[PDB]
């Protein structure tokens, strides 16, 4: 698929998702929620959407990545919503792996008001 930017890595066939990288250094205060920039834009294959989810690597550092949805239509740059649930400040280095992007099929149906 087509991408723009360099904050995303190719993956192995047996891997489920692509690693997302922080576009710059980030400092998270205790309890802070922050949208982390990746600097990448994607062109998803029709019929699919991207699920953003945490990597165990950073989850073990006290940072919870909130579930993200990348729509087939979405052409903006990808940001990862992250919260620091620990009691101290945490720093993320530039280009550090922060999340995983997984491409899943999406089903579209019309809504009928029935019983």
For its own copies, the binding residues (CB under 8 A) are 1-4, 8-18, 31, 33, 35, 41-43, 45, 48-49, 53-56, 59-62, 64-75, 79, 81, 83, 85-87, 100, 102-115
Q: In the numeric block, which tokens belong to residue 67?
A: 């579930």
- Nearest distance from C-beta of residue 25 to its own copies, angstroms: 20
Q: Which residue is it, tokens 């009691």?
A: 87
- Nearest distance from C-beta of residue 2 to its own copies, angstroms: 4
User: Which residue, 91 or 105, is less far from its own copies as judged by CB?
Assistant: 105
**52 Cβ neighbours under 8 A, 6+ residues apart:** 20, 65, 67, 68, 69, 70, 78, 80, 99, 100, 101
User: Which residue, 45 or 94, is less far from its own copies as judged by CB?
Assistant: 45
**7 Cβ neighbours under 8 A, 6+ residues apart:** 20, 21, 22, 23, 38, 39, 40, 78, 95
User: Which residue, 15 or 25, is less far from its own copies as judged by CB?
Assistant: 15
Query: What is the C-alpha separation between 63 and 17, in angstroms, rounded?
Result: 19
User: Which residue, 24 or 47, is less far from its own copies as judged by CB?
Assistant: 47
- Nearest distance from C-beta of residue 21 to its own copies, angstroms: 13
């Amino acid at each position: 698929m087509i991408i723009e930017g360099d904050g995303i890595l190719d993956k192995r066939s047996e891997d489920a998702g692509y690693d997302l990288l922080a576009a710059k250094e980030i400092h998270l205060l205790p309890g802070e929620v922050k949208v982390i920039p990746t600097g990448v834009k994607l062109m998803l294959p029709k019929g699919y959407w991207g699920l953003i989810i945490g990597k165990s690597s950073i989850g073990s550092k006290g940072l919870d990545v909130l579930g993200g949805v990348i729509d087939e239509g979405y052409r903006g740059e990808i940001g990862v919503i992250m919260i620091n649930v620990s009691r101290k400040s945490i720093t993320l280095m530039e280009r550090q792996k922060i999340a995983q992007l997984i491409i899943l099929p999406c089903k579209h149906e019309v809504l009928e008001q029935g019983k």
